């Protein structure tokens, strides 16, 4: 059929010219049924029309088309567990988005897409309903009603085929969980494919570290209950026999380093094959080759297994690549943090030969900073150069500020509140300013700190701190005296070995003491400072100013922060007042902890702790009584009331503040007291020595699935505190408090774990060696960690 004119009916958005271009048929050409059908199909596939009708009028070809309504808005109802923004992103990725057209036959497709999304996120019984609301100007609104349903949780993770290790032990290390006790923090009880793959790899590594070279996971099954509210996981495996490591050989283009590589592959004949040690050997060879300028030193291991004698003989293939030189390290995404803040964390240096391990170390350090959500690396080859690269780091930044408010409890300190506001990246400069405050049964502390972590490019820090500290002694099981102090501080820090960290600094502290109960201990010290207060009343006051020089040293070799199982921590601290200050004394403290695992799985451990301290005056004075050493409590010697070990007060005969019967008074004047008066409330001494031997054992009565999250210990603590300046000649009747041979011991049990309320620790100790005055407290506990 010859065509002389072209017309359309219903075109609103699509232009006439664009439509004419779309249709292969053009004005002035023959048209048949095939051409009309092809044009109709083309219009249908364009997506802008729902119904297409092409009919021939008397002379012209009239086209009747119903344009699909345009989408105006989208609404959601019932997406409780799904964020609206990400759901909208999923919809737009699927194809449906604002501005485009809506088909009246693709509603089922969108429904099934959303159903697939919900099946992915966890809800296997979710339902979705689409409602279409027409509106004038050929518009349409698409509403979605969601019935999320009940999420499916794991009911069992089973392993069949394991004869050497019980199922609970293997499942203990998995990320996926089937038992989540209320009193413990192990994790959620959901299911995700990535978690399952990671856990299969974890199981493979668990077996391969024991010598089961022929290990093989036959197949994994995931099943749902008919109601789709529970998931059952099974892992059919097959474990071979333990294999010994006969020897290792290295072959390839080592680049003339066989002498220094063959040393790295030495193994005692008869060692049990291992999967971690072989990986470490490969990593060590890679590091040795990369220390020589190589960027990608490929290393592979292909064990040869001999089942006749059960021997594994490795075959390491080493292909040392060729040097690549960095030319630009580019950081993008650091819109707030200055360039130097990101660049000073780099181990890779621009203008130097490339090293993959160095790049990974830089990425790990940037992650450890804590200012970035995600830190990605990309090595882009420079065009026109065969051995030059540019390393690009792409960082997504967080809002690093923080408010925080915590609450804790414990017998040692009572209810303890903490509040704080911190900024770790002040104006993106790297300074970490903060304000903190704590308040427990016997003090109130408030500090303002400002730390520069890279005062010198090497890593030397420089921190300052104002602090106000109010200390009520009577509420801490000591003699009555209130001490309100305030001061500044500035401290450097020199990291020297990645474990040792020296630190020296100055400080100024002003102490105002008031409401001091008469006794021998202080008025042996007040007389030194020239004060001559009256011992018949407790309306006293004493203000002192000190310019101290604080030095220290640390050594933190512990492998794990929480429940360490091997290493040793040491911490030396000191203090000395430089001339010009009112006081003149020197103080030294030394804390130590040492873990010595006594097996291969690090389940039975021995922990030895010590805490030593000594301080005394210099210019004929004494150490202030508000800096003494207190021993006994939930941390130092378990089983003794907090701050009870050591010398006891010897009160003078004094008139009380407001005497009234039925209230216990420390033998005041209105009770017939006419001489020095003993007491049973500790004062602390100026010399401290405490030790503790602890045996950490597996929890006996807890299911092995989560028995590694509870630490059980049998401990034996011992300690003593003595006052060196006490003169035994004058006070002969009273006990000799300057004698260090008075040792206090206490043995008992201790449990520790993490509950949703915080780190819980409980302890029951039975002091079997205590002296007159000491107050025992069998059961102690701490909850929440302030």
């Amino acid at each position: 059929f010859v065509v002389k004119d072209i017309h359309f009916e219903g075109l609103q958005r699509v232009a006439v010219g664009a439509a004419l271009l779309s249709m292969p048929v053009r004005t002035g050409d023959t048209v048949n049924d095939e051409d009309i059908s092809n044009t109709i199909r083309a219009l249908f596939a364009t997506g802008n029309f729902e119904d297409v009708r092409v009919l021939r009028d008397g002379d012209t070809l009239l086209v009747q088309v119903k344009e699909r309504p345009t989408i105006a808005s989208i609404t959601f109802s019932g997406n409780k567990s799904v964020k609206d923004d990400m759901l909208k992103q999923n919809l737009e990725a699927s194809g449906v988005r604002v501005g485009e057209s809506l088909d009246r036959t693709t509603i089922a497709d969108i429904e099934k897409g959303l159903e697939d999304f919900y099946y992915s996120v966890g809800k296997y019984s979710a339902s979705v309903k689409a409602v279409v609301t027409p509106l004038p100007r050929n518009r349409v609104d698409l509403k979605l009603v969601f019935q999320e349903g009940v999420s499916a949780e794991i009911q069992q993770i089973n392993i069949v085929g394991n004869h050497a290790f019980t199922t609970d032990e293997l499942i203990s290390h998995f990320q996926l969980r089937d038992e989540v006790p209320w009193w413990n923090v192990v994790g959620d009880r959901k299911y995700q494919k990535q978690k399952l793959a990671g856990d299969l790899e974890t199981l493979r590594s668990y077996y391969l570290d024991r010598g089961y070279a022929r290990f093989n996971i036959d197949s994994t099954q995931v099943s749902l209950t008919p109601d789709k509210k529970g998931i059952y996981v099974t892992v059919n495996i097959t474990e071979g026999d333990q294999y010994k490591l006969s020897g290792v050989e290295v072959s390839g283009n080592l680049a003339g380093h066989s002498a220094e590589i063959e040393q790295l592959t030495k193994i005692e004949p008869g060692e049990l094959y291992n999967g971690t040690k072989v990986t470490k050997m490969e990593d060590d060879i890679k590091k040795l080759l990369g220390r020589y300028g190589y960027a990608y030193p490929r290393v592979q291991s292909m064990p040869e297994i001999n089942d006749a004698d059960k021997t594994v003989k490795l075959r390491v293939n080493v292909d040392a690549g060729n040097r690549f030189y960095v030319r630009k390290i580019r950081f993008e995404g650091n819109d707030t943090s200055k360039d130097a803040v990101l660049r000073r964390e780099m181990r890779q240096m621009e203008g130097a030969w490339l090293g993959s391990d160095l790049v990974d170390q830089g990425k790990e350090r940037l992650n450890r900073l804590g200012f970035f959500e995600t830190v990605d690396t990309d090595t882009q080859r420079v065009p026109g150069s065969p051995d030059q690269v540019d390393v690009v780091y792409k960082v997504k930044e967080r809002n690093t500020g923080s408010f925080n408010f915590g609450i804790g409890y414990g017998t040692e300190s009572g209810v303890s509140f903490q509040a704080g506001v911190q900024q770790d990246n002040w104006l993106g400069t790297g300074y970490a300013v903060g304000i903190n405050g704590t308040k427990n049964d016997y003090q109130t502390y408030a500090e303002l700190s400002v730390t520069n972590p890279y005062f010198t490019v090497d890593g030397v820090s420089l921190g300052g701190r104002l602090f106000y500290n109010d200390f009520q002694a009577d509420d801490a099981d000591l003699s009555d005296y209130t001490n309100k102090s305030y001061g500044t501080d500035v401290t450097l820090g020199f990291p020297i070995n990645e474990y040792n960290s020296l630190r020296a600094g100055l400080g100024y502290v002003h102490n105002s003491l008031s409401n001091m109960q008469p006794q021998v201990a202080m008025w042996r010290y007040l007389y030194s400072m020239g004060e001559h207060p009256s011992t018949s009343d407790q309306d006293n006051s004493f203000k002192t100013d000190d310019f101290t020089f604080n030095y220290g040293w640390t050594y933190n070799k512990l492998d794990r922060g929480y429940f360490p199982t091997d290493g040793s921590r040491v911490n030396l601290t000191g203090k000395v007042t430089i001339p010009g200050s009112d006081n003149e004394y020197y103080k030294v403290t030394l804390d130590t902890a040492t873990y010595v695992p006594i097996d291969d799985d690090h389940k039975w451990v021995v922990l030895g702790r010590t805490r030593w301290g000594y301080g005394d005056g210099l210019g004929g004075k004494e150490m202030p009584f508000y800096e003494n050493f207190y021993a006994g409590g939930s941390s130092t010697v378990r089983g003794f009331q907090s701050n009870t070990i050591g010398p006891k007060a010897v009160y003078f005969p004094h008139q009380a503040s407001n005497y009234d019967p039925d209230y216990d008074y420390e033998c005041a004047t209105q009770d017939g007291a006419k001489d020095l008066c003993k007491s049973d409330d500790a004062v602390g001494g100026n010399a401290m020595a405490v030790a503790s031997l602890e045996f950490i054992t597996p929890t006996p009565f807890i299911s092995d699935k989560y028995a590694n999250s509870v630490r059980t210990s049998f401990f034996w603590d011992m300690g003593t505190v003595w006052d060196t300046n006490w003169d035994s000649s004058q006070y002969s009747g009273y006990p000799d408090y300057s004698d260090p041979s008075n040792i206090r011991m206490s043995a008992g049990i201790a449990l520790q774990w993490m509950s949703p309320l915080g780190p819980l620790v409980f302890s029951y100790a039975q002091p079997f060696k205590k002296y007159d005055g000491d107050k025992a407290e069998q059961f102690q506990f701490n909850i929440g960690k302030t």
Partner: peptide, 7 residues
Amino acid sequence: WNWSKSW
């Protein structure tokens, strides 16, 4: 316990 809410 210790809650920690970012700015």
